[PDB]
Ligand binder design. Structure first.
Ligand SMILES: [Mg+2]
Ligand SMILES: [Mg+2]
Ligand SMILES: [Mg+2]
Ligand SMILES: [Mg+2]
Ligand SMILES: [Mg+2]
Lengths: 233, 204, 196, 222, 125, 195, 226, 212, 195, 196
């Protein structure tokens, strides 16, 4: 049993017709202090998987090393390490899900909420969630922390059920994700303007976008707002 | 410890075609100990019927209080109080004890004497009104009653059909609750006649 | 919350962010923490919103009744009424208020009233959760008898840093300028102050 | 302090027929007031004509179902591909659960299938392993809403024959698979109306001598 | 200070008359005429707007007042006494009825509450 | 205090009440009468927290005796029980509540019927054929359920009461030093001196 | 509960869902959360349901008396000031969280009130367990100079977000539109996207199914003449 | 819960209720509170249901191993002590158990051992365990004799559970009867309390307080 | 369990031990023998937490019986008491201590003397002319202090023991259902079947 | 405690105050919080003195044994060993360590390791109780590739402010300069830095 110290906020993600999108801001908070502004919380594994992590950063860095170590181990005595016997998203997830539940069962959890986004060998989209309790679930849209409360509602308006996935293009999906990140910046007190976004497509592969910013913000209406009730000036 | 589940018991009310029905079990207990099998939880003031679940001492106190108040109402107004009006009186009376409340789950039932419209209502211990069209439930087997009522109920039931629905809703709910049962009563209420029926049920 | 009041040559300027949080949720991102108790006596509010609003409303009442009887009150007088409420009800209040005003006789004055209910007259004052991060900056960069433009830059740069580090602060930077000329409201948006 | 348990909501329902058995469950998965997934399968085919669901804390639910499926596999290895009878599966699950007596799987487990005489069977477990064969069992969030309805409509409790007036009970006539499915659907429709954690979708697994069949139905998504 | 008049200012005279009530009725007699007529489908109340000066805006002085959405009042006698009675009548319709029963009082009971206030000024200290 | 029983038979009410007064580690007295006569045909037994029991009982006694003088009339058992319930119901939301449970056994001279009322410290009143407070019911009610008849004689009621006391003396851990039994009927209140 | 308030061109609109719950159980599937303080001042409540109802009626009552006393139509700022000073006095023990909206001679107004007595001003607001779902929709689609038709659409879309995604909210959408120089229009059950499907079976029992012990006529009438 | 067991001329009578409750919620009315350890030994359920089921099923395994090794029926004393010694090792861990280990052997005759999760092991003639134990004890104590017939003894046990089932909120559902002889136990059926109550009320004249 | 007494007279040791076994609300048994014979001329009575008492007593019994067989010799009461004390002293700092108080009454055949040892659950041993555990001493010791003589006969010891039991039965709140009395002398151990 | 490490053109400089407190009593006013784990790899210590000393001593041992086998370790390697201890024993440690070193290949590097046990490579790092007050100042005044004299002034001014506001910090300002030229210790007294 511990308490999280340096923390990362929402990870948001969704499926679209040919793959999955995932995003997460570049902030490492220290309570209310916005301590570290250059933290990458999307960690790619191979060319077909991106693991997005929220929660305790020291535990994220540990998980980051486990995944790095997993790729090394898979390559050992494996002539097809970059082909048929490459790491799948489903393998990477199940491994993490095992570790998370084992650690919670020893009463010493990895204080995280994780989303594994990727594309399988047969072109199927993979999107599944796991957290410090070892709880897992899958859905057309997945989000951690504040993202669950604010991002999911917006993303679910695009893909409300399984049958909406083939109807959703990468441009529409990316637009919804970027808009959701803006909403979280307005409303989550532990968020930052700078974020990273990753697309895993079955045709065009892994596209990792760094140093993105929330733009097209609405603040002008603030000038008209005065006082807290009766004040006019 | 929890005042609303020391004595136990339940009330349920339903609407039908030109009629309402209100029913209750007869159990009074001290937690595990069964104390009385004749503790009725439905009262009436004129043609307005009030069921009350929860702490028994409050059930009694509130009945005496609403008798008191509806009696003065009648003397001054020169007419019997109506369900809609009484419902507001119950709400007022409960909320005036906001920070020291009666631990009860009241349920109003009746037919408006002028419009002939069937009426039911329920309250939390603090006076918030729940005015449902279909049915109102209250007591230690409220979850069970919600489940029974939701599936068994259909609108515009005739008095004799409604009796069967509310009876079966109460009985099967009470049988899944340790602190309810020990007999039951059902009131079938029409605009100018009221029939009261004691139900035969398991006595454990 | 990040709030401050700074005296300068022509008078005094009050500055504040616009973020109000319930835990980590931003309940209001365009809050107005600069509130008016008299024509040219304003205050910056930090702590319990309910408490600071209730206090401010009472002060405004007291200064309105004061004016009806004895004419325009001093900034010192307004601060005294704030103190009286905060000190006497210290057990039931969580309020940190900076009082700022402009007389013609006394010119720009700033009084800070922290949790305890004490009063401190200062050249400038900083308060709120975000103030901790700018004690160093503000001490190094404050000068007495600054110009209007210099003081606006000093406040803008200061609160920009407080916002940058404090998660509890953010949104727009509101400011209110108090001089002989009158009362001027200023607003500065994220795109402006973040790049500083 | 770290709390190793959580509540993923959900509601399950098992009903044993004369020569069949059904195990149903909603597909909604939740924490607090948020929906995690509108379709997260909860009832599982474990092989050997057995179906299983472990409702409650989904991490323990998934862990247990996984371990039981594993136990079925090793039963085949160790005992010459012998079929694991429903009664044997039930006893095995008791030991899995009681294995963690002092740090329990926070789940209410139900399995269903056919017994060795071909009749319908449903077993119901508590979190620490006490189990029992039953004809009818709802589990999870809206169990208290469903069970009384089942006592009334499956076992004909408190129902008597008209004219006799409480002297003759309604006879316990056997229900067909079509009749049971109706009662399952209405149970979940009613539960969806009155319980916030119930909704989205209903998935039913029907077990007969011919094998395991699945049926899915929509539920209100509010 | 303190209201040291804790005794009745209205008392029975040897002849059984309550002087102050009689004298109040005399003040009502001097007052401007007002009337009421009840029909089958309604009631009408009316009075003369006796303007004290032509410079005065008689629209601002309301002799006919709404007490509840379904109840109105008009008077004869001392206007200031009427004005405060209307204020008290409006408030009592809420405090001793609407806030209890969630509806406006019937005419007779509101009248009863007004009467009670007027009776008390006939006996209180 | 500990055990108080009550049984309404054909033409009388019988109240049985333990004699022990235990104070921590010692039994200070073994002949305590846990009852007060409220009126000639109304008796109240009591059990609960120390001091409160007697204080409450005597307070009720005085109030009924006052009513009896004022009106030159004996209140019905039902009327007395309703008064008592209100006082306890008033008490439960007080600064320091009376922690007292009572049984009111009375003979209604108007209706020519015996009446037994059971009221707990919360103000929970019930009219019963037989009653108890605390753990007393747990041992005795199964026997009373079995044997009780509404047309029992006073002698038959006392025999059933002995069987209840014997079961208590066998299975209760505490030594309550026997019971004082009193009968309430048309002729008034009397004590069974040998039990 | 999901409640929202949206300012527009010539007025303000408020909206709310219709689910009231006791814990995880739905007590009323069509609750009326839109309350009237005065004819053209409406408010929606969340938190302790009795406290929201009680506090709006009390202020609504005092507002009516104040309106009669001053011979002026009631103002939203008066309702706001009276609510907050009442709630502050009880230091949060009255668990009322309100969105107050209305029109008066001063103009159109929109405020939020929290149980401890703090108040806020805004062009768009949301309260309740579905406030985050609703606010997401508001932050994604709100703009300045909304028309009446746009504001109704936005408000109800924000409530829908709550209905679907928040377990504490559900059933239907109530709307009330308060425009300047017009009567406020209360639109009860403006949307009905959650009607229960027809059941597979009728559960109407045969008459005489229930076992009965005693029957009797209850005397509801008064004591009779002769 | 209400469970009882008593020794008499014709062996042992065991009688239990059938109710299971989680708080006020009645989880089951059809619970088996008599474990059939083997054809000659019986055990009762009170306290923890899983603890009873698990460890008394386990006890049956230990008894079977005993008679395989020793070529002789295990004594009730030995069988009870295996269970009591086991739970005593777990003392403090939070096991919940209140059971009567009942049996009939040549050397002992009919024997009943009350075994407890506190490590208590008591031989006795009459035992009652559960939330409704006091109600059952009353009927038992007043009607018990050693020279009861098997028919009357069976009824006494049935009636004593009924007494508890009525009063005790956490007891009821149905009554299970067993009669333990030297040649083994004999099951004497499941008896619904709902139907039994009215039957007993009429035939016996008891429960006059209740309207039927 | 509750009350256990001991008295050493001229030529024997007498142990009196209550018969009640109470389990919460009910007295499950009224004929329980709270003692074990450790050797032909050594008896140990016991009282404390449930389960632990019997488990401990039987464990000691087995160990002394083992010693008796190995050496073909009966240990002295003093030796047995010292062994018992060590086991309890070992127990008090264990993971889960034995919560058991004992009296060891024995006749030393070598010295031809009766001996009574009092040992509590902490391992606090004392040799006494008369002893008790729990609250039993509070009632009885004043009587024993007054009447006791070292040259008492066994019959006189039993009379003084009756007076102790009578005082307990009068002033103790709990009903301990009488006592089983056993005498330990040169001829061994025997039970007084009428008391 | 007020500590910081700053990279510049020629390498890296570590800076720290000298106050150690037990409650409000200054147990040691001349503490050396700049500690050596290798020739040109040093660290700044904050948190539990017992913990940070024990950790540093263990690291020094590890780097000494590393050097014996594999030659001079990298600054990254030293930070990794610090992390490994801090992360794996997070439940029993209260340590906030800044690691700073000089390679010829990598030049000046700074790694910060906060309570959790995470590692963050930065151009400069600030830590300790007094650091809160200088986030604003340090962010506004830091530049990359400063000179030795500029970096000394930046650290001196920063810690001066941290000392000014933080009661837990004070005494002298110690500094250690790490370059190709070697290891230089610097000390600055109250009379020098207070007047800045
Ligand atoms: Mg029941
Ligand atoms: Mg910020
Ligand atoms: Mg639902
Ligand atoms: Mg406050
Ligand atoms: Mg029962």
């Amino acid at each position: 049993t511990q308490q999280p110290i340096v923390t990362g906020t929402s990870v948001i993600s969704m499926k679209y017709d040919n793959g999955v999108i995932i995003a997460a801001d570049n902030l490492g908070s220290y309570g209310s202090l916005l301590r570290f502004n250059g933290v990458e919380r999307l960690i790619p594994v191979g060319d077909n998987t991106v693991v997005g992590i929220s929660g305790d950063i020291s535990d994220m860095q540990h998980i980051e090393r486990l995944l790095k170590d997993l790729v090394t181990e898979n390559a050992y005595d494996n002539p097809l390490a970059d082909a048929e016997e490459a790491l799948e998203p489903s393998y990477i997830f199940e491994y993490l899900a095992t570790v998370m539940y084992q650690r919670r069962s020893k009463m010493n959890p990895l204080w995280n909420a994780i989303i594994v986004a990727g594309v399988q060998s047969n072109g199927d989209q993979f999107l599944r969630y796991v957290n410090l309790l070892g709880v897992t679930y899958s859905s057309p849209t997945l989000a951690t922390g504040f993202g669950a409360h604010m991002a999911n509602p917006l993303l679910r308006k695009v893909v409300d059920r399984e049958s909406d996935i083939p109807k959703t293009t990468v441009q529409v999906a990316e637009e919804a994700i970027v808009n959701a990140m803006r909403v979280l910046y307005y409303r989550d007190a532990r968020s930052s303007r700078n974020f990273s976004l990753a697309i895993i497509d079955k045709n065009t592969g892994l596209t990792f976008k760094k140093n993105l910013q929330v733009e097209n913000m609405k603040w002008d209406f603030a000038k008209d707002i005065k006082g807290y009730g009766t004040q006019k000036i | 410890s929890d005042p609303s589940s020391i004595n136990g018991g339940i009330v349920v009310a339903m609407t039908g075609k030109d009629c309402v029905a209100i029913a209750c079990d007869l159990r009074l207990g001290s937690q595990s100990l069964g104390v009385s099998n004749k503790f009725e939880k439905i009262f009436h003031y004129g043609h307005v019927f009030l069921g009350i679940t929860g702490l028994a001492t409050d059930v009694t106190t509130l009945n005496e209080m609403f008798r008191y108040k509806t009696n003065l109402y009648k003397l001054k107004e020169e007419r019997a109080i109506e369900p809609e009006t009484f419902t507001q009186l119950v709400s007022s009376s409960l909320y005036e004890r906001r920070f020291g409340p009666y631990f009860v789950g009241p349920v109003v039932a009746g037919i408006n004497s002028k419009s002939g419209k069937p009426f039911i209502a329920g309250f939390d211990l603090i006076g918030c009104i729940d005015e449902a069209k279909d049915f109102i439930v209250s007591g230690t087997a409220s979850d069970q009653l919600f489940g029974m009522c939701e599936s068994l109920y259909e609108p515009n039931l005739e008095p004799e059909d409604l009796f069967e629905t509310i009876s079966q809703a109460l009985l099967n709910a009470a049988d899944r609750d340790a602190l309810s049962g020990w007999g039951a009563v059902v009131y079938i209420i029409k605009k100018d006649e009221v029939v009261k029926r004691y139900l035969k049920m398991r006595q454990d | 919350t990040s709030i401050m009041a700074v005296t300068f040559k022509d008078g005094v300027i009050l500055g504040a962010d616009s973020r109000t949080t319930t835990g980590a949720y931003i309940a209001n991102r365009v809050t107005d923490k600069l509130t008016r108790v008299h024509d040219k006596i304003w205050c910056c509010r930090s702590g319990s919103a309910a408490d600071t609003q209730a206090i401010a409303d009472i002060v405004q009442y007291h200064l309105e009744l004061y004016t009806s009887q004895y004419g325009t009150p001093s900034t010192e007088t307004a601060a005294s009424v704030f103190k009286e409420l905060c000190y006497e009800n210290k057990d039931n209040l969580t309020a940190g208020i900076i009082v700022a005003g402009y007389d013609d006789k006394n010119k720009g004055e700033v009084y800070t009233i922290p949790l305890g209910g004490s009063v401190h007259k200062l050249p400038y004052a900083i308060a709120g959760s975000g103030s901790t991060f700018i004690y160093g900056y503000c001490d190094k960069n404050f000068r007495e008898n600054m110009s209007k433009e210099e003081t606006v830059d000093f406040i803008k740069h200061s609160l920009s840093q407080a916002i940058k580090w404090d998660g509890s602060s953010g949104g727009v930077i509101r400011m209110v300028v108090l001089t002989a000329a009158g009362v001027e409201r200023l607003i500065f948006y994220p795109d402006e102050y973040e790049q500083l | 302090q770290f709390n190793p348990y959580g509540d993923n909501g959900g509601t399950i329902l098992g009903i044993a027929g004369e020569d069949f058995a059904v195990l149903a469950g909603d597909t909604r998965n939740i924490t607090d007031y948020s929906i995690n997934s509108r379709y997260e399968p909860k009832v599982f085919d474990c092989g050997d004509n057995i179906v299983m669901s472990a409702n409650g804390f989904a991490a323990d639910g998934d862990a247990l179902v996984k371990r039981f499926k594993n136990s079925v596999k090793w039963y085949h290895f160790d005992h010459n591909d012998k079929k694991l009878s429903i009664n044997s599966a039930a006893r095995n699950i008791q030991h899995l659960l009681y294995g963690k007596r002092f740090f329990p799987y926070y789940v209410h487990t139900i399995i269903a299938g056919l017994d060795e005489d071909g009749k319908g069977a449903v077993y119901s477990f508590d979190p620490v392993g006490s189990y029992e064969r039953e004809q009818c069992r709802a589990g999870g969030a809206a169990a208290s809403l469903i069970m009384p309805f089942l006592d009334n409509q499956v076992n004909f409790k408190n129902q008597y024959e008209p004219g006799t007036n409480g002297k003759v009970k309604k006879p316990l006539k056997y229900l067909s698979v079509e009749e049971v499915i109706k009662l399952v659907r209405d149970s979940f429709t009613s539960a969806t109306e009155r319980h916030i954690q119930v909704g989205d979708g209903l998935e039913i697994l029907i077990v007969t001598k011919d094998g395991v069949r699945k049926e899915f139905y929509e539920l209100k998504r509010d | 200070m303190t209201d040291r008049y804790s005794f009745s200012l209205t008392t029975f005279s040897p002849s059984g008359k309550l002087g102050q009530i009689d004298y109040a009725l005399t003040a009502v007699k001097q007052g401007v005429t007002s009337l009421g007529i009840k029909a089958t489908n309604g009631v009408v109340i009316a009075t003369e707007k006796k303007s004290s000066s032509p410079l005065a805006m008689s629209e601002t002085l309301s002799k006919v007042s709404l007490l509840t959405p379904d109840i109105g009042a008009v008077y004869s006698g001392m206007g200031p006494d009427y004005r405060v009675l209307v204020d008290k009548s409006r408030k009592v319709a809420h405090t001793s009825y609407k806030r209890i029963y969630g509806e406006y009082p019937p005419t007779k009971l509101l009248v009863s509450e007004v009467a009670k206030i007027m009776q008390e000024a006939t006996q209180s200290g | 205090m500990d055990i108080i029983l009550g049984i309404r038979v054909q033409d009388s009410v019988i109240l049985a009440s333990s004699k022990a007064v235990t104070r921590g580690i010692s039994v200070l007295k073994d002949s305590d009468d846990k009852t007060r006569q409220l009126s000639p045909h109304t008796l109240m037994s009591f059990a609960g927290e120390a001091g409160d029991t007697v204080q409450f009982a005597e307070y009720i006694q005085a109030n009924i005796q006052l009513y009896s003088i004022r009106e030159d009339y004996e209140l019905s058992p039902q009327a007395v029980s309703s008064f008592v319930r209100q006082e306890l119901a008033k008490s439960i939301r007080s600064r320091r509540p009376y922690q007292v449970n009572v049984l009111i056994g009375g003979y209604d001279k108007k209706k020519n019927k015996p009446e037994l009322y059971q009221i707990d410290y919360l103000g929970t009143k019930v009219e019963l054929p037989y009653g108890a407070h605390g753990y007393s019911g747990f041992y005795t009610f199964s026997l009373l359920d079995h044997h009780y008849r509404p047309d029992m004689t006073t002698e038959e009621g006392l025999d059933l009461l002995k069987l209840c006391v014997q079961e208590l003396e066998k299975r209760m851990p505490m030594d309550f030093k026997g019971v004082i039994v009193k009968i309430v009927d048309k002729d008034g209140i009397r004590q069974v001196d040998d039990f | 509960t999901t409640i929202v308030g949206v300012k527009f061109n010539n007025g303000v609109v408020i909206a709310a869902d219709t689910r009231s719950t006791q814990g995880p159980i739905v007590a009323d599937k069509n609750c009326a959360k839109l309350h009237r303080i005065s004819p053209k001042i409406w408010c929606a409540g969340a938190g302790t349901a009795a406290d929201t109802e009680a506090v709006t009626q009390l202020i609504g009552s005092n507002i009516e008396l104040h309106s009669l006393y001053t011979s002026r139509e009631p103002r939203v700022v008066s309702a706001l000031q009276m609510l907050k000073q009442h709630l502050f006095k009880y230091q949060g023990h009255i668990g009322a969280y309100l969105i107050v909206a209305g029109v008066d001679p001063t103009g159109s107004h929109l405020f939020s009130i929290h149980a401890h007595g703090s108040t806020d001003v805004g062009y768009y607001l949301s309260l309740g367990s579905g406030s985050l779902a609703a606010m997401a929709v508001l932050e994604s689609h709100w703009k300045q100079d909304l028309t009446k038709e746009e504001a109704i659409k936005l408000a109800s879309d924000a409530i829908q977000a709550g209905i679907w995604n928040d377990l504490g909210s559900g059933s239907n959408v109530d709307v009330c539109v308060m425009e300047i120089g017009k009567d406020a229009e209360y639109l009860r059950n403006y949307l009905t996207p959650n009607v229960r499907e027809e059941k597979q079976k009728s559960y109407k029992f045969p008459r005489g199914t229930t076992a009965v012990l005693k029957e009797s006529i209850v005397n509801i009438c008064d004591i009779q003449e002769e | 819960t209400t469970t009882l067991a008593f020794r008499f001329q014709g062996g042992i009578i065991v009688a239990v209720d059938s109710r299971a409750t989680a708080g006020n919620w009645v989880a089951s009315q059809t619970v088996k509170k008599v474990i059939e350890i083997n054809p000659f030994l019986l055990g009762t359920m009170a306290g923890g249901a899983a603890d009873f089921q698990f460890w008394e099923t386990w006890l049956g395994s230990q008894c079977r191993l005993h008679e395989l090794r020793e070529k002789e029926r295990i004594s009730v004393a030995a069988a009870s002590k295996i269970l009591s010694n086991l739970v005593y090792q777990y003392k403090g861990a939070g096991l919940s158990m209140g059971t009567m280990i009942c049996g009939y052997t040549r050397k002992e005759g009919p024997t009943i051992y009350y075994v407890d999760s506190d490590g208590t092991r008591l031989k006795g003639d009459i035992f009652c365990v559960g939330s409704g134990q006091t109600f059952a004890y009353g009927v038992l104590d007043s009607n018990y004799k050693w020279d009861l017939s098997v028919e009357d003894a069976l009824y006494l046990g049935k009636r004593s559970i009924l007494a508890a089932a009525h009063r005790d909120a956490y007891s009821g559902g149905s009554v299970n009867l067993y009669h333990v002889t030297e040649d083994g136990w004999i099951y004497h059926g499941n008896h619904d309390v709902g139907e039994l109550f009215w039957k007993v009320k009429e035939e016996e004249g008891s429960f006059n307080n209740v309207i039927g």
